Design a protein around this ligand. Structure first.
Ligand code: BK8
Ligand code: CA
Ligand code: CA
Ligand code: CA
Ligand code: CA
Length: 466
């Protein structure tokens, strides 16, 4: 099968950025260029663009890689990328926008954080990196400056950003490059031999700060701090720690363990007692979402692409707040995936809610029933349901299928503007040279009403609307 993934939709456009976007204001300025809030000139929808001035050939490939990395990441606590434009003088990297600002500013405002708030935040950050490390990718510059809150809501969701220092790592070899930020750098990075557990240390520093308001490793200036850091000794001796629970500190000790091999992993960090620190969902919304997932029947690739496009790229965060809640609770381990058992327990948990008797359950029947949902829903055939996949399938088709979303999807697909989606255009969407004669055949056979060899906007409409 041609594997449907959110990242395939992000392509090198050669349309003029200016033709479709207008700048609203500066969000931040770098050495590279600036990050600019932009609006789609036609829909008014807002995005954040990272604009990079050119100077020659070395610069580009290094970037193409930051992009490719970001395409492969499809996770609720990781930055979402929509597309990228290149100019004679510039690169534009268009992406979703998180308007809540840097967790850094929230820490300078709020000063301290509740055990509840901190746990939710660190759990999310850890889920993001657990996923990353599962994909053999290490972030390497984690800090509150590089964590954005989605919006100005009180308990806003977190996004990890700025993968410009991130890289692939192999468990065979070790990394040597010194990369990170003073307060948050792991001692092995200074030493020159490191692996993914540097990210754990960084996040461990973050946690310490969230709870107490101060960094665990301090000093008068950068060099001083790096000396302190490198010796690794830290204290819970400040008065503010008296009012934090022991389990939180236990987690921190394990995350700031000096010796990397004795340091807890991201994956195991998620399972710590403290991280379930909490303080519900309406049954109707849960019921509908479950019913939508059960009723999703697999389909030809063109529909699968279209739906995934609309779900993964064209829904907003505000639309998916309900869905986001349900997903996170069905993800018992927090790893950013729904697996077979988590799905099965979702159904069971719903059954408890409904008064349906548990013992009654035919475990084998349910298992088979879950296997088939996963088969239908798992767009990329990786055996697991990612966030985007979930949203696509679990949102009420009439809502996701708003008239605007449909029309915009079709326009994206009909790349040559001919009013009709060709097999080559379908190949283009997947990121593949051409489509299997058989898979294209499987499409027309179900969708091509005129019988003119392509899918026009009305044929497209029927296709999803059934
Ligand atoms: C290869 C493409 O990489 C990209 C593309 C776009 C990006 C945009 C921002 C961005 C930046 C800022 C402002 N930041 C300046 C840098 N320090 C963090 C604050 C706020 C944002 N809200 N929503 C955003 N998306 C913001 C940050 C990193 C990005 C990386
Ligand atoms: Ca999971
Ligand atoms: Ca999947
Ligand atoms: Ca066409
Ligand atoms: Ca046709």
């Amino acid at each position: 099968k041609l594997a449907a993934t959110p990242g395939m939709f992000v392509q090198h456009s050669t349309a003029a950025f200016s033709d479709r976007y207008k700048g609203q204001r500066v969000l931040g300025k770098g050495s590279f260029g600036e990050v600019i809030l932009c609006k789609d000139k036609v829909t008014g929808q807002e995005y954040a663009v990272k604009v990079i001035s050119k100077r020659q050939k070395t610069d580009k490939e290094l970037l193409l890689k930051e992009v490719e990395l970001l395409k492969k990441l499809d996770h609720p606590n990781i930055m979402k990328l929509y597309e990228f434009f290149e100019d004679k003088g510039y690169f534009y990297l268009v992406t979703e926008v998180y308007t809540g600002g840097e967790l850094f500013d929230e820490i300078i405002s709020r000063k301290r954080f509740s055990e509840v708030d901190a746990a939710r935040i660190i759990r999310q950050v850890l889920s993001g990196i657990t996923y990353m490390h599962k994909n053999k990718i290490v972030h390497r510059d984690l800090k509150p400056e590089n964590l954005l809150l989605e919006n100005k809501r009180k308990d806003a969701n977190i996004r990890i950003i700025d993968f410009g220092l991130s890289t692939h790592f192999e468990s065979t070899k070790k990394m040597k490059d010194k990369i990170g930020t003073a307060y948050y750098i792991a001692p092995e990075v200074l030493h020159g031999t490191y692996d993914e557990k540097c990210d754990v240390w960084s996040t461990g520093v973050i946690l310490y700060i969230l709870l107490s308001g101060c960094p665990p490793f301090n000093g008068a200036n950068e060099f001083d701090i790096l000396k302190k850091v490198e010796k690794g000794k830290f204290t819970f001796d400040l008065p503010q720690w008296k009012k934090v629970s022991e389990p939180a500190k236990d987690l921190i000790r394990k995350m700031l363990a000096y010796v990397p091999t004795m340091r807890i992993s991201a994956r195991d960090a998620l399972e710590h007692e403290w991280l379930k620190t909490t303080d519900s969902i309406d049954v109707p919304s849960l019921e509908s979402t479950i019913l939508n997932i059960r009723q999703f029947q697999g389909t030809q690739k063109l529909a699968a692409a279209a739906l995934l496009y609309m779900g993964s790229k064209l829904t907003t965060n505000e639309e998916t707040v309900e869905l986001n809640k349900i997903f996170q609770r069905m993800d018992k381990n927090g790893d950013g995936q729904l697996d077979k058992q988590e799905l099965m327990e979702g159904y069971v948990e719903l059954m408890k809610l409904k008064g349906e008797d548990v013992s009654a359950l035919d475990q084998s029947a349910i298992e088979f029933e879950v296997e088939q949902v996963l088969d239908a829903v798992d767009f990329d055939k990786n055996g697991f349901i990612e966030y985007s996949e979930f949203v696509t399938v679990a949102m009420d088709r009439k809502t996701l299928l708003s008239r605007q979303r449909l029309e915009r999807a079709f326009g994206m697909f009909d790349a040559d503007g001919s009013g009709k989606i060709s097999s080559s255009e379908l190949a283009t969407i997947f990121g593949v040279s051409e489509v299997d004669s058989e898979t294209w055949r499987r499409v027309l056979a179900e969708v091509d009403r005129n019988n003119d060899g392509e899918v026009d906007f009305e044929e497209f409409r029927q296709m999803l609307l059934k």
